[PDB]
Design an enzyme around this catalytic site. Sequence first.
Site, PDB file in Angstrom:
ATOM      1  N   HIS A  45      60.082  36.510  10.558  1.00 50.87           N
ATOM      2  CA  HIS A  45      59.085  37.558  10.403  1.00 50.87           C
ATOM      3  C   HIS A  45      59.201  38.645  11.459  1.00 50.87           C
ATOM      4  O   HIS A  45      60.144  38.675  12.262  1.00 50.87           O
ATOM      5  CB  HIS A  45      57.677  36.956  10.395  1.00 50.87           C
ATOM      6  CG  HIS A  45      57.331  36.237  11.657  1.00 50.87           C
ATOM      7  ND1 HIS A  45      57.986  35.093  12.058  1.00 50.87           N
ATOM      8  CD2 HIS A  45      56.426  36.516  12.626  1.00 50.87           C
ATOM      9  CE1 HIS A  45      57.498  34.696  13.220  1.00 50.87           C
ATOM     10  NE2 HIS A  45      56.553  35.541  13.584  1.00 50.87           N
ATOM     11  N   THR A  48      61.323  43.606  10.544  1.00 49.93           N
ATOM     12  CA  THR A  48      62.674  44.121  10.645  1.00 49.93           C
ATOM     13  C   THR A  48      63.703  43.322  11.422  1.00 49.93           C
ATOM     14  O   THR A  48      63.396  42.568  12.360  1.00 49.93           O
ATOM     15  CB  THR A  48      62.632  45.543  11.244  1.00 49.93           C
ATOM     16  OG1 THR A  48      61.882  45.510  12.464  1.00 49.93           O
ATOM     17  CG2 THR A  48      61.939  46.499  10.288  1.00 49.93           C
ATOM     18  N   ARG A  49      64.946  43.521  11.007  1.00 51.81           N
ATOM     19  CA  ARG A  49      66.082  42.856  11.608  1.00 51.81           C
ATOM     20  C   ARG A  49      67.268  43.820  11.668  1.00 51.81           C
ATOM     21  O   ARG A  49      67.583  44.522  10.695  1.00 51.81           O
ATOM     22  CB  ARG A  49      66.459  41.629  10.770  1.00 51.81           C
ATOM     23  CG  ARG A  49      65.417  40.517  10.796  1.00 51.81           C
ATOM     24  CD  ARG A  49      65.464  39.847  12.170  1.00 51.81           C
ATOM     25  NE  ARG A  49      64.665  38.640  12.306  1.00 51.81           N
ATOM     26  CZ  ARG A  49      63.340  38.625  12.462  1.00 51.81           C
ATOM     27  NH1 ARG A  49      62.671  39.762  12.494  1.00 51.81           N
ATOM     28  NH2 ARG A  49      62.687  37.468  12.616  1.00 51.81           N
ATOM     29  N   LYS A 265      59.612  49.403  17.775  1.00 53.18           N
ATOM     30  CA  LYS A 265      59.510  47.975  18.020  1.00 53.18           C
ATOM     31  C   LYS A 265      60.596  47.568  19.009  1.00 53.18           C
ATOM     32  O   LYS A 265      61.758  48.005  18.894  1.00 53.18           O
ATOM     33  CB  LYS A 265      59.661  47.209  16.701  1.00 53.18           C
ATOM     34  CG  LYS A 265      59.764  45.710  16.843  1.00 53.18           C
ATOM     35  CD  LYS A 265      60.059  45.081  15.488  1.00 53.18           C
ATOM     36  CE  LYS A 265      60.714  43.724  15.629  1.00 53.18           C
ATOM     37  NZ  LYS A 265      61.215  43.245  14.314  1.00 53.18           N
ATOM     38  N   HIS A 269      65.877  40.253  24.531  1.00 50.12           N
ATOM     39  CA  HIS A 269      66.767  39.239  23.972  1.00 50.12           C
ATOM     40  C   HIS A 269      67.222  38.064  24.834  1.00 50.12           C
ATOM     41  O   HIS A 269      67.262  36.924  24.374  1.00 50.12           O
ATOM     42  CB  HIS A 269      68.000  39.961  23.440  1.00 50.12           C
ATOM     43  CG  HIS A 269      68.867  39.127  22.554  1.00 50.12           C
ATOM     44  ND1 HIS A 269      68.396  38.506  21.421  1.00 50.12           N
ATOM     45  CD2 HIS A 269      70.201  38.878  22.598  1.00 50.12           C
ATOM     46  CE1 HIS A 269      69.401  37.907  20.798  1.00 50.12           C
ATOM     47  NE2 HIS A 269      70.503  38.120  21.493  1.00 50.12           N
ATOM     48  N   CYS A 315      58.027  34.759  17.704  1.00 49.27           N
ATOM     49  CA  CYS A 315      58.933  34.128  16.771  1.00 49.27           C
ATOM     50  C   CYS A 315      59.941  33.279  17.565  1.00 49.27           C
ATOM     51  O   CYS A 315      59.882  33.266  18.799  1.00 49.27           O
ATOM     52  CB  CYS A 315      59.512  35.261  15.912  1.00 49.27           C
ATOM     53  SG  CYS A 315      61.211  35.171  15.324  1.00 49.27           S
ATOM     54  N   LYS A 348      71.113  38.879  10.037  1.00 43.84           N
ATOM     55  CA  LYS A 348      71.981  39.868   9.406  1.00 43.84           C
ATOM     56  C   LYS A 348      73.066  39.208   8.548  1.00 43.84           C
ATOM     57  O   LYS A 348      73.564  39.817   7.609  1.00 43.84           O
ATOM     58  CB  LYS A 348      72.644  40.749  10.467  1.00 43.84           C
ATOM     59  CG  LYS A 348      73.597  39.995  11.383  1.00 43.84           C
ATOM     60  CD  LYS A 348      74.199  40.896  12.478  1.00 43.84           C
ATOM     61  CE  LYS A 348      73.173  41.225  13.561  1.00 43.84           C
ATOM     62  NZ  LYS A 348      72.748  39.995  14.301  1.00 43.84           N
TER      63      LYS A 348
END
Length: 385
Positions: A45, A48-49, A265, A269, A315, A348
């Site tokens: 969720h 976007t990715r 957003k 990472h 997430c 992706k």
Amino acid sequence: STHFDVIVVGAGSMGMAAGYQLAKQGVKTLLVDAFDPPHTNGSHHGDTRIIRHAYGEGREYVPLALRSQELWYELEKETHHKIFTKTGVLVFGPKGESAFVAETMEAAKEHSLTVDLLEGDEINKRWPGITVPENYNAIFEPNSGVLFSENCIRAYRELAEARGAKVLTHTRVEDFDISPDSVKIETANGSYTADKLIVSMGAWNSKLLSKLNLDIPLQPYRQVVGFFESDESKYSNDIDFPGFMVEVPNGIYYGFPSFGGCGLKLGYHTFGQKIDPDTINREFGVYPEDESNLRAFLEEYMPGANGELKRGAVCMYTKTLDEHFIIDLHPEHSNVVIAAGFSGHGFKFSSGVGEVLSQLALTGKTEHDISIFSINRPALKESLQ
Ligand SMILES: *Cc1cc2c(cc1C)nc1c(=O)[nH]c(=O)nc-1n2C[C@H](O)[C@H](O)[C@H](O)COP(=O)(O)OP(=O)(O)OC[C@H]1O[C@@H](n2cnc3c(N)ncnc32)[C@H](O)[C@@H]1O
Ligand SMILES: [Cl-]
């Protein structure tokens, strides 16, 4: 009373794409999920990715990325749900100080990918809103973009169900019984058998793979993202602000342009809290780092996008020791397929992986070279109980 050709445990990013590929071929498929995909308890969720082609994590991923991109374009044409926006993806870092940037450049060269190289002020001039030191260089990929992940899963689900695939929601699989010619799953709502099994439980692979006599180091991480009020004349997708993954002194950050004014957003990472998928705190802001690590990057590199926090999400990443995926047959059961450890960068490729899983389940083989994802590779530290 209902046997299936194939059972998919975990109908998320990888499982639902596999379900679509199977159903598309008339394979009687059952997909079982702990919730109702798409949902907000897994790793898909946050709307976007990013999808990139020149791969900094390693050039060996390019073929799968290109095949996935084509499958995303195919999905776009098949459904009314929006699938992909070609925002392009910008990658940057300090010159000579980023293996990520360096491998992205090598991957682009090695595969003849279309990219723009620029540095210092050229970056700031090309995209008003980005402020990087002059010693920074970048590689821009114009044909890369943004995937609307929840729409993808929802689309793959509608299409697979239209073809006969059954999705059993809110049913947690608790144990497996594998024999040489059949598989069986156990759930509170009943047990089911099939000829083949695909296991793609996401973060829960770290807790339930032991039920398949597998012992693989898999670490779940809490990873938050935030949406921030931004200067729309600079960070909107409408004015071509790109998606991005960059490397700065303190780590890697990734972000998306503001879509429809919902705000830029951002996500950090390389840092996250080690957690257990069943006890993780899914509330954004409970740790001071959630918001502070993001603004730390924004005020320095994208100052016009450091406004009011409009929204947050929590997430999970599930990492392997080498941070490469696990896509292979179960070492002791050729009728069981494993999909795990996507280490924070697998969405992706989900369309492409769906295709690979289907082939593996149906033929025990795949046309794709998936040796780098072998469950028997040494850097993984895999074993049996
Ligand atoms: C978290 C995250 C990840 C992420 C990202 C940003 C954030 C905040 N940005 C990405 C990006 O820009 N580009 C990219 O390529 N990847 C990015 N990611 C990573 C990607 O989202 C993950 O790698 C991907 O989603 C992994 O997919 P997978 O299919 O492994 O995980 P899932 O979608 O969570 O699905 C698992 C499903 O299985 C179910 N489940 C779990 N246990 C059970 C049991 N016991 N029984 C039945 N079902 C089970 C879950 O409910 C879930 O739906
Ligand atoms: Cl992940």
